[PDB]
Structures are given as C-alpha cells and as structure tokens.
C-alpha cells in the first residue's frame, strides 16, 4: 500500500 | 491552484466523429492519471476512460459500452489529454467531464450532443 | 461489473438534524485492508465535488460534519448536522476495479 501520489486519492491502491 | 477546462463538444451525427480536449494545470501533470467520465439523465455518471502515468506506460482503458470507437489520449509536454471518440450513438449524448488524480480534480465538462 | 444501488433515492431532513444514506455494493470493494469506496456531493450547475476517500477519509477542507463508514459491501455517508447549503445530489463511488462505477445518487432536500 504505498503513497497513491497522481493515482489521487479516489483512484485505485497498488500494488 | 487546480484548474481542469475541457473544450470540443457540441453536435454531431450519428455515426460521426468528435475530439474533446482538457487543459490541466496546479499539478504536475506527467504524474497525474487522468479520466473523462459523462453524466446523463437516463445513466447518471459514467466512467469513461482512464490513461494512467509515464511510469505506467500511459496505459489506457475504457468502459466496455465505448470500447473500439473511444480514444483517450494525452500530450505531457503541453498539459493536455484527448478523448477521440468515432461512430458516435445517440447514447454518448451527455455532459463529459475530464478528471485529475483519478477523481479527486474535475472540471466544469462540455456538452456532446448526437442527434441528426 | 461492481453495482452501486443507493438507498433511499431521496431524503427530507430538517437544519441541525442527522441525514443518513446508504450503498450498498454487489461485490467486496475491499483491497489491500482498504475499502476503495468514494463520496461525491453535486451541487445544481455543478460537477461532482470528492467529500469522502478510502470509506472514511476526509477530503481536503471538507467539513467535519461530513462522515463516513462502512467496509466490505456496505456504506454510508452522515451528514450532521445538516444545513442549507447540503443540499445536492450524493453519489457513491468505486475505485476496487475497472470499470470505476458510481451509484445511482440520492438527493438531500433541506426541510424549512
């Protein structure tokens, strides 16, 4: 679960 | 300051093409996983299409309803993406908003319109 | 697909009073111990607007009255206590898997 960063923070989580 | 404005819309043909553009600034852009999603009375909001960063290869995808005929697109030189969008439905007919950080950034959207 | 179905479609509830609403998803939006489950509210003329990140998260300058909860299939958004400028059209939203979907909204209408 890092940072979501230009994902934003409504995208989608990683990895 | 984020500022999404989105342009191109209007009235088209069934059957014909149209290019909506999204200027995006107050974050950096090459960075951002962009989307277009559309609103209408009839199917409320809809996710459109997602193109991600330069670290994810710009990876695109779309809503299954617009696969084939819909492009998104994007220019990280000059802030911009691109929804392509060929043989246009009467369906596709609604308000089309580009989104910044997946959704957290939404601009003010532009009306497409198709009808004869 | 992942279904939002938004309950109740609609809601009349006085100043300074507990507003309430519900999404329910048709699958787990659970990932990574993280509920990817989003709030929007949309004002009349206006795009959606993000209130609520990650189930329960606030979004940046969001009022504190403005809450969250839920995990796994279910939801909700409280609003309390209301005031005039709540009302607007709330929608749920998914970020669990493509495709994003959003539910269907649920309008707040402010009792005088």
């Known amino acids: 679960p890092g940072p979501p960063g230009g994902r934003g923070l409504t995208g989608p989580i990683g990895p | 300051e984020v500022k999404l404005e989105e342009s191109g819309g209007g009235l088209v043909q069934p059957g014909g093409s149209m290019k909506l553009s999204c200027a995006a600034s107050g974050f950096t852009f090459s960075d951002a996983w962009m989307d277009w999603v559309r609103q209408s009375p009839e199917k409320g909001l809809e996710w459109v299409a997602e193109?991600?960063?330069?670290?994810?290869?710009?990876?695109?995808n779309y809503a299954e309803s617009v696969k084939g005929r819909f492009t998104i697109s994007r220019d990280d030189s000059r802030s911009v993406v691109y929804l392509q969008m060929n043989n246009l439905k009467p369906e596709d007919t609604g308000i089309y908003y580009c989104?910044?950080?997946?959704?957290?950034?939404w601009g003010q959207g532009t009306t497409l319109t198709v009808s004869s | 697909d992942i279904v939002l179905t938004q309950s109740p479609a609609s809601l009349a509830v006085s100043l300074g009073q507990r507003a309430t609403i519900s999404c329910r998803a048709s699958e787990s939006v659970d990932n990574y111990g993280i509920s990817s489950m989003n709030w929007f509210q949309q004002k009349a003329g206006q795009p959606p607007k993000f209130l609520i990140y990650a189930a329960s998260k606030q979004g940046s300058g969001v009022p504190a009255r403005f809450s969250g909860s839920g995990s796994g299939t279910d939801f909700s958004l409280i609003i309390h206590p209301v005031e005039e400028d709540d009302t607007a059209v709330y929608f749920c939203?998914?970020?669990?898997?493509?495709?994003?979907?959003f539910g269907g909204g649920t309008k707040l209408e402010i009792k005088r």
């Open positions: 193109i991600r960063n330069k670290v994810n290869n710009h990876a695109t």
């Open positions: 939203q998914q970020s669990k898997g493509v495709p994003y979907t």
């Open positions: 989104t910044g950080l997946t959704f957290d950034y």
